[PDB]
Design a protein around this ligand. Structure first.
Ligand SMILES: [Ca+2]
Length: 478
């Protein structure tokens, strides 16, 4: 497992307790509002995962791993189960050490890959630094591995964020990094073996940005297998660049505007076409960039506009565009969610309406992506081209051998029968291009100005229809 394969794999974000559960549990008590562990065994994947496959995605992205603390801290618990007040044990709320390597060893055979998201920096403690414990921190026992105490402030600076304390008295994410050999070197050794057995064939960070330049590389290398630095900031020239340090980069910046212009019918697409461009070099790519949408710490896209179209075109472009297109857990069922605590949400809180709107769009469209490569790879690199940006967007992605997919997406669930001519996408005068998912034929002959026929947001991607043999895809029947 490692960097050049990864690039291509659709990403699927989960929790577990909330998701996983051999029990099915259609009615299981667990309303974020009250937080606290919802008895939901990780193992649930071997019975589960049919949820991911139907969609097109090849990766399993789920939460950090250990045992934080046992005592519903006012807040209501760490179930989000990012923290580390033990790192070296391996919980039980989930269910039984061994089983994990087993869940993986299992699927690993079955299909897809393994993404383990880590928060390395903070060791999470109930209490205020002056009330600091130190004894609850294995691999630690002393304070020394941790840091001094000051509230991260003067944000803009970047001469504190990377060392100082991260949090609010109510909880103090204890800062480790004495600045020198110790911490890094240390935590370096750890991961790479944690990796050894249990799975760990792709990894990620919750604490990128504020780390200190150097730690990212050291760790990225401590354990081979591809990495994803997660933290935020979304602003091409800093969020990107670190692509070199690490491996995979959060497309933090990509999302922001996609959110910005998406939602509001007239929204403001130019900000993007200019955007798509900034990254495309500014970031050392190799296609090593990450596409979220909703975002755990964020309110599931839906918090805004309550319409499929605005949703579909987004999710599609995300996936369809440059970077890992990560469909976050609950995206599908159209779970509005909340800025926080109410972002979690047992994807299973229902018996799998496995054929709802989002499921269908995901399945049929994601497939095409993977498919294209299989017969002819190289769609990876292909710098996802801006070709044209009007009131609505259309871009070009792929190789030679009439091996070309061109995507044009518009906004408004209100809809209004929309028929245009795709500008670039430069094809062969007479060439036939299928609609995608739902199907529909696009004629690119006459002048060389491809007829694009829209309804509201469906999204509309024009695939060459000559490179599909006798297979699945669109309207073959198989
Ligand atoms: Ca730190």
């Amino acid at each position: 497992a490692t960097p050049a394969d990864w690039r291509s794999q659709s990403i699927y974000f989960l929790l577990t307790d909330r998701f996983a559960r051999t029990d099915g549990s259609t009615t299981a008590t667990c309303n974020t509002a009250d937080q606290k562990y919802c008895g939901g065994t990780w193992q649930g994947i071997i019975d589960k995962l049919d949820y991911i496959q139907g969609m097109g995605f090849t990766a399993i992205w789920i939460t950090p791993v250990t045992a934080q603390l046992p005592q519903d801290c006012a807040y209501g618990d760490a179930y989000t189960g990012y923290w580390q007040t033990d790192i070296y044990s391996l919980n039980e709320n989930y269910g039984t050490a061994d089983d994990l390597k087993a869940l993986s060893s299992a699927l690993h055979e079955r299909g897809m890959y393994l993404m383990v998201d880590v928060v390395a920096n903070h060791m999470g403690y109930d209490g205020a630094g002056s009330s600091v414990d130190y004894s609850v921190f294995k691999p630690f026992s002393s304070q020394d591995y941790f840091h001094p105490f000051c509230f991260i402030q003067n944000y803009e600076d970047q001469t504190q964020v990377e060392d100082c304390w991260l949090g609010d008295n109510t909880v103090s994410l204890p800062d480790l990094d004495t600045t020198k050999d110790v911490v890094k070197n240390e935590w370096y050794d750890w991961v790479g073996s944690l990796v050894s057995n249990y799975s760990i064939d792709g990894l990620r960070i919750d604490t990128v940005k504020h780390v200190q330049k150097d730690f990212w590389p050291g760790y990225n290398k401590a354990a081979g297998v591809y990495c994803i630095g997660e933290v935020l900031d979304g602003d091409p020239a800093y969020t990107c660049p670190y692509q070199n340090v690490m491996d995979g980069v959060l497309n933090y910046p990509i999302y922001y505007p996609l959110l910005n212009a998406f939602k509001s019918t007239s929204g403001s697409m130019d900000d993007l076409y200019n955007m798509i461009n900034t990254v495309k070099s500014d970031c050392p790519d190799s296609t090593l960039l990450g596409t979220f949408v909703e975002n755990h710490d964020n309110p599931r896209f839906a918090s805004y506009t309550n319409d499929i179209a605005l949703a579909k075109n987004v999710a599609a472009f995300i996936i369809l565009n440059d970077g890992l297109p990560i469909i976050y857990a609950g995206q599908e069922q159209h779970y509005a969610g909340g800025n926080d605590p109410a972002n979690r949400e047992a994807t299973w809180l229902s018996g799998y309406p496995t054929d709802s709107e989002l499921y269908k769009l995901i399945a049929s469209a994601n497939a095409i992506r993977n498919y294209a490569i299989s017969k002819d790879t190289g769609f990876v690199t292909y710098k996802n081209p801006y070709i044209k940006d009007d009131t609505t967007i259309a871009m070009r992605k792929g190789t030679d051998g009439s091996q070309i997919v061109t995507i044009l997406s518009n906004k408004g669930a209100s809809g209004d029968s929309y028929t245009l001519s795709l500008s670039g996408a430069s094809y062969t005068a007479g060439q036939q291009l299928t609609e995608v998912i739902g199907c529909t034929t696009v004629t690119v002959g006459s002048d060389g100005n491809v007829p694009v026929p829209m309804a509201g947001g469906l999204p509309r991607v024009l695939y060459p229809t000559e490179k599909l043999a006798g297979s699945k895809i669109c309207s073959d029947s198989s």
